[PDB]
Symmetry: C2
Subunit: 119 residues, 2 copies
Protein backbone atom coordinates (compact mmCIF):
# COMPACT_ATOMS: atom_id res chain seq x y z
CA UNK A 1 0.00 0.00 0.00
CA UNK A 2 1.21 3.48 -0.95
CA UNK A 3 -1.17 4.68 1.67
CA UNK A 4 -1.42 8.16 3.24
CA UNK A 5 -1.44 9.15 -0.40
CA UNK A 6 -3.92 11.80 -1.47
CA UNK A 7 -4.65 14.31 1.39
CA UNK A 8 -1.29 15.01 3.09
CA UNK A 9 1.14 14.84 0.16
CA UNK A 10 -1.68 16.81 -1.32
CA UNK A 11 -0.58 19.91 0.60
CA UNK A 12 3.09 19.52 -0.42
CA UNK A 13 1.84 22.39 -2.62
CA UNK A 14 1.33 24.18 0.70
CA UNK A 15 5.14 24.30 1.23
CA UNK A 16 5.84 24.80 -2.52
CA UNK A 17 3.79 28.08 -2.19
CA UNK A 18 1.89 30.62 -4.30
CA UNK A 19 1.82 28.86 -7.70
CA UNK A 20 4.41 26.93 -9.71
CA UNK A 21 8.10 27.04 -10.37
CA UNK A 22 9.51 23.58 -10.84
CA UNK A 23 11.83 24.36 -7.83
CA UNK A 24 13.73 25.79 -10.84
CA UNK A 25 16.30 27.99 -9.12
CA UNK A 26 18.98 25.27 -8.95
CA UNK A 27 19.05 21.56 -9.82
CA UNK A 28 19.87 20.77 -6.15
CA UNK A 29 18.60 17.82 -4.04
CA UNK A 30 17.73 16.34 -7.44
CA UNK A 31 21.47 16.45 -7.83
CA UNK A 32 21.90 15.34 -4.19
CA UNK A 33 19.75 12.26 -3.82
CA UNK A 34 20.89 11.08 -7.24
CA UNK A 35 22.19 7.49 -7.10
CA UNK A 36 22.12 7.02 -3.31
CA UNK A 37 21.09 3.53 -2.05
CA UNK A 38 23.35 2.25 -4.88
CA UNK A 39 24.90 -0.71 -3.00
CA UNK A 40 24.19 -2.51 0.27
CA UNK A 41 26.69 -0.68 2.55
CA UNK A 42 24.16 2.10 2.90
CA UNK A 43 22.65 3.11 6.18
CA UNK A 44 24.11 6.59 6.82
CA UNK A 45 22.59 9.19 4.53
CA UNK A 46 18.97 8.02 4.47
CA UNK A 47 18.89 8.64 8.22
CA UNK A 48 20.29 12.22 7.96
CA UNK A 49 18.47 13.63 4.88
CA UNK A 50 15.65 12.81 7.29
CA UNK A 51 17.34 14.84 10.05
CA UNK A 52 16.88 18.10 8.21
CA UNK A 53 13.34 16.96 7.20
CA UNK A 54 12.89 16.67 10.97
CA UNK A 55 14.08 20.26 11.57
CA UNK A 56 11.96 21.01 8.50
CA UNK A 57 8.56 20.55 10.09
CA UNK A 58 9.89 21.60 13.49
CA UNK A 59 10.79 25.00 11.94
CA UNK A 60 7.50 25.51 10.00
CA UNK A 61 4.98 26.15 12.85
CA UNK A 62 2.25 27.97 10.75
CA UNK A 63 -0.44 26.77 13.18
CA UNK A 64 -3.52 26.47 10.90
CA UNK A 65 -1.80 26.51 7.55
CA UNK A 66 -0.12 23.07 7.29
CA UNK A 67 1.31 22.60 10.75
CA UNK A 68 -0.93 19.62 11.74
CA UNK A 69 0.20 17.65 8.67
CA UNK A 70 3.94 18.45 8.78
CA UNK A 71 3.38 16.83 12.14
CA UNK A 72 1.45 14.13 10.37
CA UNK A 73 4.19 13.42 7.75
CA UNK A 74 7.09 13.96 10.18
CA UNK A 75 5.30 11.45 12.47
CA UNK A 76 5.53 8.61 9.92
CA UNK A 77 9.27 9.32 9.46
CA UNK A 78 9.31 7.07 12.48
CA UNK A 79 8.86 4.02 10.30
CA UNK A 80 11.35 5.66 7.94
CA UNK A 81 14.09 5.76 10.57
CA UNK A 82 13.34 2.66 12.65
CA UNK A 83 10.32 2.63 14.96
CA UNK A 84 10.56 -0.91 16.26
CA UNK A 85 10.67 0.27 19.88
CA UNK A 86 9.60 3.36 21.88
CA UNK A 87 13.05 4.76 22.73
CA UNK A 88 13.54 5.84 19.13
CA UNK A 89 11.76 8.89 20.53
CA UNK A 90 14.21 10.02 23.20
CA UNK A 91 17.33 10.66 21.22
CA UNK A 92 16.16 12.83 18.31
CA UNK A 93 14.84 15.72 20.48
CA UNK A 94 18.33 15.25 21.87
CA UNK A 95 19.46 15.09 18.25
CA UNK A 96 18.14 18.63 17.93
CA UNK A 97 20.81 21.40 17.69
CA UNK A 98 22.72 24.12 19.65
CA UNK A 99 25.60 22.66 21.64
CA UNK A 100 25.68 24.95 24.73
CA UNK A 101 28.49 24.71 27.34
CA UNK A 102 26.39 22.30 29.30
CA UNK A 103 26.43 20.06 26.21
CA UNK A 104 29.97 20.29 24.85
CA UNK A 105 31.08 17.84 27.52
CA UNK A 106 33.27 15.85 25.09
CA UNK A 107 34.99 13.71 27.80
CA UNK A 108 33.37 10.51 26.42
CA UNK A 109 35.40 11.47 23.35
CA UNK A 110 36.99 8.09 22.68
CA UNK A 111 33.62 6.32 22.67
CA UNK A 112 33.59 5.34 19.00
CA UNK A 113 35.47 1.99 19.10
CA UNK A 114 32.39 -0.05 19.84
CA UNK A 115 31.05 -0.06 16.24
CA UNK A 116 33.43 -1.37 13.52
CA UNK A 117 35.00 -3.57 16.19
CA UNK A 118 32.57 -6.54 16.55
CA UNK A 119 34.20 -9.19 14.44
Amino acid sequence: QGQFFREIENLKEYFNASSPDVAKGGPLFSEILKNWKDESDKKIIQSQIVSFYFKLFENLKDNQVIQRSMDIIKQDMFQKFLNGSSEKLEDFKKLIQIPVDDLQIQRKAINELIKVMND
Copy 2:
Protein backbone atom coordinates in the same frame (compact mmCIF):
# COMPACT_ATOMS: atom_id res chain seq x y z
CA GLN B 1 43.18 -4.51 16.45
CA GLY B 2 43.19 -0.72 16.60
CA GLN B 3 46.08 0.55 18.66
CA PHE B 4 47.10 3.65 16.72
CA PHE B 5 45.83 5.70 19.71
CA ARG B 6 49.14 6.13 21.67
CA GLU B 7 49.87 9.68 20.51
CA ILE B 8 46.32 10.45 19.31
CA GLU B 9 43.96 9.36 22.11
CA ASN B 10 46.63 10.84 24.43
CA LEU B 11 45.52 14.21 23.12
CA LYS B 12 42.11 14.03 24.78
CA GLU B 13 44.19 14.98 27.87
CA TYR B 14 44.93 18.21 25.97
CA PHE B 15 41.25 18.99 25.31
CA ASN B 16 40.43 18.92 28.98
CA ALA B 17 43.16 21.51 29.12
CA SER B 18 44.38 22.72 32.52
CA SER B 19 42.74 20.29 35.10
CA PRO B 20 40.60 19.13 37.66
CA ASP B 21 40.20 15.38 37.08
CA VAL B 22 36.47 14.94 36.49
CA ALA B 23 35.18 17.26 33.89
CA LYS B 24 32.13 18.27 35.98
CA GLY B 25 29.48 17.83 38.58
CA GLY B 26 27.94 16.14 35.57
CA PRO B 27 26.91 12.85 35.35
CA LEU B 28 25.56 13.93 31.97
CA PHE B 29 27.95 12.20 29.53
CA SER B 30 27.46 9.15 31.70
CA GLU B 31 23.71 9.63 31.99
CA ILE B 32 23.65 10.40 28.26
CA LEU B 33 25.10 7.48 26.26
CA LYS B 34 24.63 4.62 28.78
CA ASN B 35 22.22 2.01 27.37
CA TRP B 36 21.82 3.18 23.72
CA LYS B 37 23.03 0.25 21.58
CA ASP B 38 21.23 -2.08 24.00
CA GLU B 39 19.11 -3.16 20.99
CA SER B 40 20.79 -3.52 17.62
CA ASP B 41 17.89 -2.46 15.50
CA LYS B 42 18.91 1.20 15.88
CA LYS B 43 21.77 2.03 13.52
CA ILE B 44 20.82 5.69 12.93
CA ILE B 45 21.79 8.19 15.74
CA GLN B 46 25.33 6.72 15.92
CA SER B 47 25.96 8.84 12.84
CA GLN B 48 24.64 12.03 14.51
CA ILE B 49 26.46 11.58 17.84
CA VAL B 50 29.61 12.02 15.77
CA SER B 51 27.90 14.91 14.00
CA PHE B 52 28.03 17.18 17.06
CA TYR B 53 31.56 15.88 17.17
CA PHE B 54 31.86 17.41 13.69
CA LYS B 55 30.18 20.36 15.42
CA LEU B 56 33.08 20.45 17.92
CA PHE B 57 36.41 19.92 16.12
CA GLU B 58 35.17 22.06 13.23
CA ASN B 59 34.55 24.55 16.09
CA LEU B 60 37.96 24.71 17.92
CA LYS B 61 40.97 24.86 15.44
CA ASP B 62 43.55 25.29 18.26
CA ASN B 63 46.65 26.41 16.37
CA GLN B 64 49.04 23.45 16.37
CA VAL B 65 48.39 22.84 20.07
CA ILE B 66 44.99 21.12 19.63
CA GLN B 67 44.44 21.51 15.84
CA ARG B 68 46.35 18.48 14.54
CA SER B 69 44.44 16.51 17.15
CA MET B 70 40.99 17.51 16.01
CA ASP B 71 42.39 17.08 12.53
CA ILE B 72 43.53 13.56 13.30
CA ILE B 73 40.54 12.71 15.52
CA LYS B 74 38.11 14.26 13.05
CA GLN B 75 39.38 12.02 10.31
CA ASP B 76 39.18 8.60 11.98
CA MET B 77 35.42 8.99 12.54
CA PHE B 78 34.12 8.63 8.94
CA GLN B 79 36.00 5.31 9.11
CA LYS B 80 33.75 4.49 12.10
CA PHE B 81 30.22 5.06 10.83
CA LEU B 82 31.05 4.63 7.11
CA ASN B 83 34.57 4.10 5.57
CA GLY B 84 32.61 2.03 3.00
CA SER B 85 32.91 4.34 -0.05
CA SER B 86 34.84 7.51 -0.96
CA GLU B 87 31.71 9.51 -1.65
CA LYS B 88 30.11 10.15 1.74
CA LEU B 89 32.98 12.51 2.61
CA GLU B 90 31.41 15.04 0.23
CA ASP B 91 27.96 14.28 1.67
CA PHE B 92 29.03 15.81 5.02
CA LYS B 93 30.33 19.17 3.72
CA LYS B 94 26.69 19.75 2.83
CA LEU B 95 25.80 18.47 6.30
CA ILE B 96 27.38 21.68 7.67
CA GLN B 97 24.26 22.72 9.68
CA ILE B 98 23.42 26.19 8.33
CA PRO B 99 20.93 26.00 5.43
CA VAL B 100 20.99 29.66 4.29
CA ASP B 101 17.99 30.23 1.87
CA ASP B 102 18.74 29.09 -1.73
CA LEU B 103 19.72 26.00 0.37
CA GLN B 104 16.50 24.61 1.96
CA ILE B 105 14.74 23.95 -1.29
CA GLN B 106 12.35 21.48 0.39
CA ARG B 107 10.50 20.61 -2.87
CA LYS B 108 11.79 17.06 -2.74
CA ALA B 109 10.76 16.46 0.87
CA ILE B 110 8.27 14.04 -0.78
CA ASN B 111 10.46 11.23 -2.27
CA GLU B 112 12.18 9.38 0.68
CA LEU B 113 8.80 7.57 1.20
CA ILE B 114 10.52 4.69 -0.68
CA LYS B 115 12.50 3.31 2.30
CA VAL B 116 8.99 1.98 2.88
CA MET B 117 9.55 -1.40 1.36
CA ASN B 118 13.21 -2.00 0.53
CA ASP B 119 12.40 -5.72 1.05
